[PDB]
């Protein structure tokens, strides 16, 4: 159906321990496909998915040059951020960026993104119009004025409507065996006595791709939001994801509870119960 491409930058200053580290990771959907680390023995963009390997040497050189230039730019950005927030040169700070595009089933642009953060807080973002900015504070407003003067949004827009969608379409074709394959969850309910009169029911989803999933418990057909323990979706390390949802229920009432599972790999949502 729909798909996304995102690049994520982390630039971390480290006074006393060299120049700030710069890391880039690139994803299509929930699949890592490229990385760059300025601390690498010989820093280059490196493939992390089989389908990007067929890109030619020109690709790798160009992509590597972008990352080396950005290492310098984001180092400059860290210095500028110090000035804008009146901060000392003694502390460690982080700038993050996430940017990319979403496309529909027809491959047309659904929306573009380009956002930055400073020390984990929103700093500046390209608006959905790809024409204007939202600045988080008076420091970011300085950046906004510079970017407005230099027509940076127009540059973003031309990328997000052109190269971003074009390259993503090609990756989706080259990787169709995996990027266009949903693996549904394998599901089961376990039952663990807590004590004479309480039991934990745990609803498991395993082996699914992509990561997006919904797991809910009902009691007598009523969602149990407040009483459900839900773990964060976690990577299995084989491309797939895992998740579970758990409720504590009175002994002898197990059958009043049903686990409901939604995932794009399922033709219909699943309903599961403890199977004694």
């Amino acid at each position: 159906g729909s798909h996304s491409m995102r690049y994520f930058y982390t630039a971390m200053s480290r006074p006393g321990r060299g120049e700030p580290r710069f890391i880039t990771v690139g994803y299509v959907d929930d699949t890592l496909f490229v990385r760059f680390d300025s601390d690498a023995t010989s820093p280059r963009k490196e493939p992390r998915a089989p389908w990007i390997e067929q890109e030619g040497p020109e690709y790798w050189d160009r992509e590597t040059q972008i990352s080396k230039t950005n290492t310098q730019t984001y180092r400059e950005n860290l210095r500028t951020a110090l000035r804008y927030y009146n901060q000392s040169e003694a502390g460690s700070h982080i700038i993050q960026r996430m940017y990319g595009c979403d496309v529909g089933p027809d491959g047309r642009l659904l929306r573009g993104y380009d956002q930055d953060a400073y020390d984990g807080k929103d700093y500046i973002a390209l608006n959905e119009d790809l024409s204007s900015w939202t600045a988080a504070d008076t420091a970011a407003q300085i950046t906004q004025r510079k970017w407005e003067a230099a027509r940076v949004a127009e540059q973003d827009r031309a990328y997000l409507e052109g190269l971003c969608v074009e390259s993503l379409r090609r990756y989706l074709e080259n990787g169709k065996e995996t990027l266009q394959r949903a693996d549904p969850p394998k599901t089961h309910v376990t039952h663990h006595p807590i004590s004479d009169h309480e039991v934990t029911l745990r609803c498991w989803a395993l082996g699914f791709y992509p990561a997006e999933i919904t797991l809910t418990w009902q009691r007598d057909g009523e969602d149990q939001t407040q009483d459900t323990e839900l773990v964060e979706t976690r990577p299995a390390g084989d491309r797939t994801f895992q998740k579970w949802a758990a409720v504590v229920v009175p002994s002898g009432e197990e059958q009043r509870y049903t686990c409901h599972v939604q995932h794009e790999g399922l033709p219909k949502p699943l309903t599961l119960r403890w199977e004694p």
Binding site: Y7, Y59, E63, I66, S67, T80, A81, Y84, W147, Q155
Partner: peptide, 9 residues
């Protein structure tokens, strides 16, 4: 493919 232009803060 990345965007090759990165404006300074």
């Amino acid at each position: 493919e990345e965007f090759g232009r990165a404006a300074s803060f």
